[PDB]
């Protein structure tokens, strides 16, 4: 089971996206664990993720998080997918980042 961690200083809004992603992962039997955390834990919690996703509000922090976790694929969630709360779409982008990372 791969760990997909989402980071944003506003878990409440990201938390809703996480619940929809979990529903989708169950529907299609994707072996993943999805958790939302505030941006302050990106360095502490990110070390255990298989893929690190940043909320669109914290996109400006991408370079810093990449330097903090040089051995993890880190990327920003598409703002439209995020605003629309597209659990399936974001789940797809996360699995993709993992595949593109393992090869």
């Amino acid at each position: 089971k791969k760990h997909i961690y989402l980071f944003s200083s506003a878990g409440m809004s990201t938390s809703l996206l996480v619940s929809k992603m979990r529903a989708q992962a169950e529907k299609y039997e994707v072996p993943v664990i999805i958790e939302a955390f505030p941006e302050t834990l990106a360095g502490e919690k990110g070390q255990n993720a298989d893929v690190v996703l940043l909320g669109p509000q914290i996109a400006y922090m991408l370079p810093e998080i990449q330097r903090l976790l040089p051995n993890k694929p880190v990327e920003v969630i598409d703002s439209l997918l995020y605003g629309k709360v597209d659990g399936l779409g974001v789940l797809k982008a996360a699995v993709a980042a993992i595949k593109k990372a393992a090869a």
Partner: protein, 103 residues
């Protein structure tokens, strides 16, 4: 909701950045850099002011599907803003003390 929810995320992030700047301002003071501390507090204040202004609008036109009821996220947004504003004010006092400590 759409904007209100995305707006709250922005407010939470803004409030978080404000605190971050405030703590950073304090750190400057510890280094004996009163000039940088002062500049950081000013920017932090401005950030809060803009955030507070947005919240003011969010309280004057309080949503809420039901009669008296209001947007739930309002209180959440207020929580972050109130905490950040208070923190900064106290931090400002702390910085002034550092100045009095001579250092």
């Amino acid at each position: 909701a759409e904007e209100l929810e995305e707006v709250v995320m922005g407010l939470i992030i803004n409030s978080g950045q404000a605190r971050s700047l405030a703590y950073a301002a304090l750190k400057q003071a510890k280094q004996g850099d009163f000039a940088a501390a002062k500049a950081m507090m000013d920017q932090s204040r401005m950030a809060l002011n803009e955030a507070h202004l947005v919240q003011t609008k969010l309280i004057e036109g309080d949503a809420g599907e039901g009669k008296m009821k209001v947007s739930l996220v309002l209180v959440e947004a207020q929580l972050h803003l109130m905490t950040s504003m208070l923190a900064r004010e106290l931090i400002t006092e702390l910085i002034e003390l550092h100045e009095k400590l001579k250092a």
